[PDB]
Structure formats: structure tokens, C-alpha cells
Amino acid sequence: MVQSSVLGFPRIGGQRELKKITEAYWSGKATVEELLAKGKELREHNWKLQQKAGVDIIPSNDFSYYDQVLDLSLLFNAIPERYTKFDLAPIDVLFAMGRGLQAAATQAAVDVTALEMVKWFDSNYHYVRPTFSHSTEFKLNTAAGIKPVDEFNEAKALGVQTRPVILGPVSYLYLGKADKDSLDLEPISLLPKILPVYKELLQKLKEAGAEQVQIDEPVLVLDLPEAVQSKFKEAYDALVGADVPELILTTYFGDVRPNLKAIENLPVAGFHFDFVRVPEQLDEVASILKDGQTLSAGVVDGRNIWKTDFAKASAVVQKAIEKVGKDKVVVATSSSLLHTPVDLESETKLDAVIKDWFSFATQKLDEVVVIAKNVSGEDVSKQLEANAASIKARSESSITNDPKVQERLTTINEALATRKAAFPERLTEQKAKYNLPLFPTTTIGSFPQTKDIRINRNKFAKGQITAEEYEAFINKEIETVVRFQEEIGLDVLVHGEPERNDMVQYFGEQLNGFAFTTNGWVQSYGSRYVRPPIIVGDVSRPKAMTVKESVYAQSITSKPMKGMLTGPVTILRWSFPRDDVSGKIQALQLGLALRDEVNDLEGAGITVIQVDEPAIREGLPLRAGKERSDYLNWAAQSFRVATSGVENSTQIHSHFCLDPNHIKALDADVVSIEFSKDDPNYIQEFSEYPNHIGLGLFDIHSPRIPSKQEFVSRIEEILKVYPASKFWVNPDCGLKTRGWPEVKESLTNMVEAAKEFRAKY
Numbered sequence: 134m135v136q137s138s139v140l141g142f143p144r145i146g147g148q149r150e151l152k153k154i155t156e157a158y159w160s161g162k163a164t165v166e167e168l169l170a171k172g173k174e175l176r177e178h179n180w181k182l183q184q185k186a187g188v189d190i191i192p193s194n195d196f197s198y199y200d201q202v203l204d205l206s207l208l209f210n211a212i213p214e215r216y217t218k219f220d221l222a223p224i225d226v227l228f229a230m231g232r233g234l235q236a237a238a239t240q241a242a243v244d245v246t247a248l249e250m251v252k253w254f255d256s257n258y259h260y261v262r263p264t265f266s267h268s269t270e271f272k273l274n275t276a277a278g279i280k281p282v283d284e285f286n287e288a289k290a291l292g293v294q295t296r297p298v299i300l301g302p303v304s305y306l307y308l309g310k311a312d313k314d315s316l317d318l319e320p321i322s323l324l325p326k327i328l329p330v331y332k333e334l335l336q337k338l339k340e341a342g343a344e345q346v347q348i349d350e351p352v353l354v355l356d357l358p359e360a361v362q363s364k365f366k367e368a369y370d371a372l373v374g375a376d377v378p379e380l381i382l383t384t385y386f387g388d389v390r391p392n393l394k395a396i397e398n399l400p401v402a403g404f405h406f407d408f409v410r411v412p413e414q415l416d417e418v419a420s421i422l423k424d425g426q427t428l429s430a431g432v433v434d435g436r437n438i439w440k441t442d443f444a445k446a447s448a449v450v451q452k453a454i455e456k457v458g459k460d461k462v463v464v465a466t467s468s469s470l471l472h473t474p475v476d477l478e479s480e481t482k483l484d485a486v487i488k489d490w491f492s493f494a495t496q497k498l499d500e501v502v503v504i505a506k507n508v509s510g511e512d513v514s515k516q517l518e519a520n521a522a523s524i525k526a527r528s529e530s531s532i533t534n535d536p537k538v539q540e541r542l543t544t545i546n547e548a549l550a551t552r553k554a555a556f557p558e559r560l561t562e563q564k565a566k567y568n569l570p571l572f573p574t575t576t577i578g579s580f581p582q583t584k585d586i587r588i589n590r591n592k593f594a595k596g597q598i599t600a601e602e603y604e605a606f607i608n609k610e611i612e613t614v615v616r617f618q619e620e621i622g623l624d625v626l627v628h629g630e631p632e633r634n635d636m637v638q639y640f641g642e643q644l645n646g647f648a649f650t651t652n653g654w655v656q657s658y659g660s661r662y663v664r665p666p667i668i669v670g671d672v673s674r675p676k677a678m679t680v681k682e683s684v685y686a687q688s689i690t691s692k693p694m695k696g697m698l699t700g701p702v703t704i705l706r707w708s709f710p711r712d713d714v715s716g717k718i719q720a721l722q723l724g725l726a727l728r729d730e731v732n733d734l735e736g737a738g739i740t741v742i743q744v745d746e747p748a749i750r751e752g753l754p755l756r757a758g759k760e761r762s763d764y765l766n767w768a769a770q771s772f773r774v775a776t777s778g779v780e781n782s783t784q785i786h787s788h789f790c791l792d793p794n795h796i797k798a799l800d801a802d803v804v805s806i807e808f809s810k811d812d813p814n815y816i817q818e819f820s821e822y823p824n825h826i827g828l829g830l831f832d833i834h835s836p837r838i839p840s841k842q843e844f845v846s847r848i849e850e851i852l853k854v855y856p857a858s859k860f861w862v863n864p865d866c867g868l869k870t871r872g873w874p875e876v877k878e879s880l881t882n883m884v885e886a887a888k889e890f891r892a893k894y
């Protein structure tokens with residue numbers, strides 16, 4: 134009987150219960166008792182769901198109040214000393230590490246900054262960086278409760294035997310970093326210090342009744358130095374024994390084969406591999422399995438929302454079985470379901486035809502169960518036919534296939550992805566048209582939204598005000614924002630984006646080929662969740678998406694007004710993508726759609742246009758090689774397809790917040806980049822690059838208003854390495870999140886600073 138397995142379950146709650154209780158706890162509205170009770174209710178509900186679905190191997194320890202990686206840091210005492218000085222209980226040290234701590238002045242006021250949040254591989258999840266010192270003393274924090282033991286026992290008392298999930302020692306160290314007081318520390322060097330702590334944990338788990346543990350080593354999908362590769366043998370020889378559970382060494386998101394020698398002689402009880410991302414590694418990883426080791430075949434996607442093709446997924450599982458035996462194969466999710474929304478049944482608005490194409494986390498439980506039944510030999514012909522019916526329906530739908538878009542993709546060529554002239558030529562035309570001063574000043578697009586704008590957006594959404602009346606409210610807010618920038622002397626203006634509530638959905642809703650959810654929430658970081666759009670079909674742009682507000686904003690000033698678009702790569706990366714066509718094709722369709730928009734802005738007199746690509750690094754393939762170099766190429770091509778239809782005197786800006794070669798490949802006239810927190814070398818990499826650059830002069834995610842003189846010095850430092858003729862002056866990013874008084878004196882200072890450089894030059 135081939136078993137089914139789930140690597141982890143989203144913990145947020147089908148009604149975002151976990152957000153609501155954690156935020157109430159942080160705001161003082163809930164007690165720690167109420168927090169802990171809600172966490173227990175969620176874990177019970179999710180274990181029972183899984184048990185009811187028939188899943189054999191059910192996870193525990195996959196729950197968290199903030200981040201599972203930080204949970205391990207608390208558990209092993211990797212807690213920087215600065216957090217321990219406030220008589221905080223362990224849960225509150227946890228939350229301090231994750232989200233910072235502010236305490237009144239007595240001493241000057243406390244503001245302890247959170248530990249760094251880091252992207253978890255190429256997922257859209259973020260973890261809290263494990264942070265280590267020379268003095269770090271790893272040990273089990275017994276008084277804090279031992280989370281994996283306690284949750285295991287909690288499950289067992291409900292009659293649900295689980296498999297605890299922990300991040301393994303190699304990955305945990307390797308993904309961490311040295312704290313500021315220990316900059317010469319290599320985290321992996323600490324392996325002999327942490328191994329005993331994992332061994333004690335594992336002993337305690339075995340003593341509690343856990344017979345198997347899922348031990349995640351996802352760094353096996355990265356390019357690993359040889360000296361790191363040898364550490365798996367060291368680590369797992371130490372851990373495996375009679376006194377601990379069986380270990381299933383678990384990998385996801387990529388290809389382990391370059392590291393196969395590292396895991397070919399381990400004493401573990403089995404492995405898990407991701408055959409959704411890399412089905413082609415099956416043969417080779419199957420080939421190294423020892424006698425009795427088992428193979429967990431990850432065939433239900435943990436990172437996207439499409440209904441699994443049961444035939445194709447069973448076929449992958451069957452190839453494994455043919456190599457190693459029915460007795461030694463498990464059917465699994467490819468990764469944790471952390472990366473999927475909770476339940477498709479919550480959607481109130483999607484048409485049944487489209488819903489039929491989808492499976493969210495709750496549905497994926499049934500999938501792994503049915504697939505394991507099918508390969509075990511049970512008659513699930515009904516479920517298979519029903520599944521094959523669904524698959525076939527999507528394949529043929531006109532929603533998926535738009536022949537006009539297909540025809541347009543064939544038109545893509547070098548000319549479509551190249552400006553009419555190179556930058557030096559273009560610059561001559563732009564100097565004639567705009568005559569911008571040296572050290573031109575600008576901002577990134579968004580400004581603080583009033584309370585009245587947010588109330589009116591709600592009222593418009595109910596028809597309580599007419600479209601005409603909402604437009605008037607938005608234009609009034611644009612006027613205010615333009616008037617402000619004029620009075621303080623900014624040279625290239627923006628409209629403040631009051632009409633936009635999200636950088637991707639604002640465009641998706643106006644594009645064909647997209648579907649949206651009502652409750653499709655995924656954890657991004659802590660209690661901050663995203664509800665990604667879904668790309669369902671071929672993408673096109675029926676009409677103007679942004680032109681009206683930008684033309685209004687340009688109409689009330691003689692200063693150049695930036696139009697403002699999210700780039701194709703970001704819209705793709707922050708959506709659930711199609712799994713039937715490449716990311717490349719999706720990005721090029723998005724590039725063509727955005728080209729119509731750039732073209733329409735230019736035509737309407739908006740001849741300065743910025744394209745925001747915050748998510749460019751985020752799709753970077755995980756290993757060096759052809760995939761990675763292809764991605765950088767198509768990512769740049771898709772941006773160039775969006776932007777290369779314009780006249781030479783039209784000024785294209787790109788905002789990033791990356792490899793300088795890639796930046797240069799976009800051939801933007803002006804770039805802005807987050808830069809206020811680095812190497813003076815990267816700056817010199819664009820010494821001889823003619824196109825212009827604005828390095829962010831202050832942190833928009835903080836609010837400590839820099840003086841005029843503070844700006845002058847930050848600029849003098851860049852000028853030592855960078856010519857004055859190319860330098861633009863701007864903030865790090867948009868100002869949507871900041872308050873007006875901070876915005877106003879900071880901006881006023883920034884301009885006053887630039888003008889001093891204009892006098893000197």
C-alpha cells in the first residue's frame with residue numbers, strides 16, 4: 134500500500150485567523166493565553182483535515198507564529214544577546230527577533246531592530262536569518278517548552294500520529310550569517326557545536342513516540358562548495374542511531390544531482406525529491422538509494438494552484454516504483470504547502486469552469502491520497518476520468534489560447550527589443566526636450582494616501598459615489614501631490630499613485646488572461662500575506678490602464694510627469710503562473726501588453742515613463758548555468774519589448790529595489806536603485822556606462838529625516854566614484870508608507886542638497 138505524505142500545511146487559517154490573533158496579541162488586544170489557544174485550535178483543525186483526507190504521513194512542527202526558521206533559532210539558543218536584556222518571556226524574545234522592539238526612554242528610547250528577513254529560495258516566502266556569534270552557545274531552551282515535542286504530543290493526544298519537520302543542521306547553518314560582532318565567522322564552522330543539540334532534540338522526539346522525522350536539507354539544490362558537501366556525511370553519521378527517529382532527508386525546489394556524491398553514503402532512512410520542478414532527476418537519485426532506504430516522490434506542486442494531472446503524476450511515481458520497489462516509494466507534495474492558499478472552497482466569485490482547473494492546499498491533500506491509491510492498484514477510474522476531463526477542458530479552452538496573442542509573439546525580433554537609437558544619441562534629444570539641470574531631482578512614484586481617499590475608495594466600490602465623483606477625489610489628491618512637489622523644487626514629478634492599491638493587481642485586473650481570488654492568501658512574511666493574481670490564459674491589454682491619471686497629473690504642471698508601470702517580470706513573479714507554458718512566454722506576452730500601454734502614454738504626452746521591476750532577482754534560477762543565463766536574457770528582453778517602441782526623446786526609467794550587466798542590458802535612460810545601505814566597487818562597474826543612475830539617498834522603510842548636510846555627504850561619497858553628469862537624486866523607493874512631515878522635510882533637504890552641487894558644478 135503506497136503511502137501518501139504532506140511536507141507541511143499552511144498555518145494562516147482559512148479565515149486568516151492566525152493574522153488576526155497575532156496582530157491582536159502584538160497590539161495588546163489579546164493575551165498570550167488567547168494567542169496560544171488559537172494556535173492550538175489551528176493545529177488541531179489542520180491535523181484533522183489531513184487525517185480525514187486519508188494522508189498517511191502528516192507533518193507536525195510545520196506550524197509557526199511567525200517563521201519556522203526563527204522557531205529553530207529560539208529552540209537552539211541562537212538568540213543575539215541584545216534581545217535578552219528586556220525581561221521578555223521566550224515568545225516575546227521570538228517576536229522581538231522577528232519584528233523588532235521599541236521601549237520608552239528612561240537611557241534613550243529603545244528601538245531594537247529585527248533580524249534580517251530573507252527570501253526562502255525562489256519561493257515567495259521569507260524567513261528570519263539565523264544569526265550567530267563566536268560566543269553563541271547552542272543548547273535546548275527547555276523552559277521555553279520544546280516546540281516540536283510539545284506539538285508532536287498535542288497531535289498524538291488527538292489520535293493523530295505525525296512526522297515532525299525540522300530544518301537540518303547543514304541548511305540551518307549555511308542559510309545563516311555571522312552577527313556584526315563576529316564578521317570573520319563562517320556559519321558552517323559551527324557544525325560540531327550544533328550537532329549535539331540536534332541529537333538531543335531527536336532523542337526527545339523518539340522518547341515522545343516519534344518514529345520518523347522529516348529533516349529538510351534544501352541547500353542540496355544549490356551550488357555547494359566541496360567543503361560544504363562533505364558535511365552531510367559528518368552531520369548524519371552523528372545523528373542517526375538507535376536512540377533517535379528514522380530520518381527522511383528532504384529536498385525541494387531544484388536539482389540535487391550536482392551534489393549527489395554528498396548524499397550517496399548516508400545512514401538516513403530515506404530521501405524526498407521534488408519531481409515537479411525537476412522530474413528529470415528521478416533516475417539518477419533513485420540509483421543511489423541503499424537497501425531499505427525509501428524514496429518520497431514529490432509530484433503534487435506545493436507552490437502553485439493548478440489541479441494535478443493524475444495520470445502524469447502517477448506515471449512519475451510509477452517510474453520510481455519500477456526502479457526501487459512499491460514498498461519503498463511514497464507519494465508526496467513536492468514541497469510544503471506553505472506556498473499555496475488554504476482552501477479553494479472559500480472562493481465565492483470564481484466561475485465553476487475556472488475553479489475546476491484549480492486545487493488549493495486542502496484539495497492537494499485529496500490528490501496525494503488518490504495518486505497513492507492509483508499506483509497501489511485500486512479502482513479510482515472515476516476520479517481519474519473526472520480528473521482527465523478537467524485537464525482536457527483547460528487544455529482546449531479559448532481562455533488559454535488567444536490566436537491574436539500567438540500571432541504577435543511571432544512578430545518578436547531584435548528590432549522590437551531595441552530603441553531607435555543608442556543612449557548617447559537619445560541623450561541629445563532628451564537634453565533638448567527637457568533641459569534638465571545637473572543633479573536632477575525626482576521621486577519613485579507613490580506618496581502618502583489621505584484617510585479621505587481610503588474611505589472614498591470604499592464608497593466608490595459600493596456605488597455610494599459615482600465613477601465621476603471618485604475621479605474627482607483622485608484628481609484632487611493628485612493635485613495636492615503635484616503642488617507639493619512643485620513648491621519644493623523637484624525636477625521630474627510623479628502623480629502619487631492614489632488610485633492604486635497594489636503594484637500587480639492594479640494591472641492584472643485590467644489585463645485579459647488573469648483570474649483573481651477572494652481568499653487565496655499565502656504567507657509572505659510574519660503576519661503579512663499576499664493574495665496573488667493567477668495567470669490562466671494568454672495575456673493581452675484591451676485598453677489604457679494608467680493613462681487617465683497620468684494625463685491629469687501632467688495637465689496641471691509644466692514639469693515633466695513620470696508615467697508609472699510595473700514590469701512584465703514582476704507581474705509574472707508575483708502571480709501564480711501558468712504551468713502549461715514557460716515563464717519566458719508569459720513574460721513576453723506581458724511585455725507586449727505593457728508595450729501598448731507605454732505607447733499609449735507616450736501618445737497622450739506622457740514622455741517620461743518609469744517601469745518598476747522589484748522582482749527581477751526573485752526568479753533567478755537557483756544554480757549557475759544555462760537556465761540562469763537564459764532567464765536573465767529573457768527578463769531583459771521582455772522589459773525591452775515593453776519599452777522600445779518609443780521615440781528617442783522619450784525618457785525611460787527603470788526602478789529596482791542586481792548584476793550590473795543585466796541592468797545595462799535593459800538600456801533604460803535613467804535607473805533608480807535602493808542604495809543607501811555597500812561596496813564602492815559595483816558603483817565603479819558603471820563608470821563608463823553612459824546611461825544615467827540615481828542611487829537611493831535615504832531609507833524609505835525608516836523615518837529618521839536626514840539633514841541637508843546628511844544628503845550632501847552621501848552624494849559627495851558617490852561622486853568620488855561616479856561622474857556628476859550621470860547622477861540623479863532620489864529616495865530609495867515609493868513613499869506610500871511614510872507620513873507627510875517626514876516626506877516634506879526629507880524631500881526639501883534632498884532638493885536643497887542637489888542645488889548646492891549645481892552651484893559648485
Ligand SMILES: CN(Cc1cnc2nc(N)nc(N)c2n1)c1ccc(C(=O)N[C@@H](CCC(=O)O)C(=O)O)cc1
Pocket residue numbers: 634635636637638657658660661662663664665666707708
Ligand atoms: C514584501 N512585500 C512586497 C510584495 C510581495 N509580494 C507581492 N505579491 C503580490 N501579488 N502583490 C504585491 N503588491 C506584492 N508585494 C509585501 C508583502 C506583504 C504585504 C502586506 O502587508 N500584505 C497585506 C495585504 C496585501 C494586500 O491587500 O494586497 C496584509 O496585511 O496581509 C506587503 C508587502
Ligand SMILES: N[C@@H](CCS)C(=O)O
Pocket residue numbers: 577578579636697745747788790866867868869
Ligand atoms: N512606483 C512604486 C514603486 C514600488 S517598487 C512606488 O513608488 O511605490
Ligand SMILES: [Zn+2]
Pocket residue numbers: 577747788789790865866867
Ligand atoms: Zn521600489
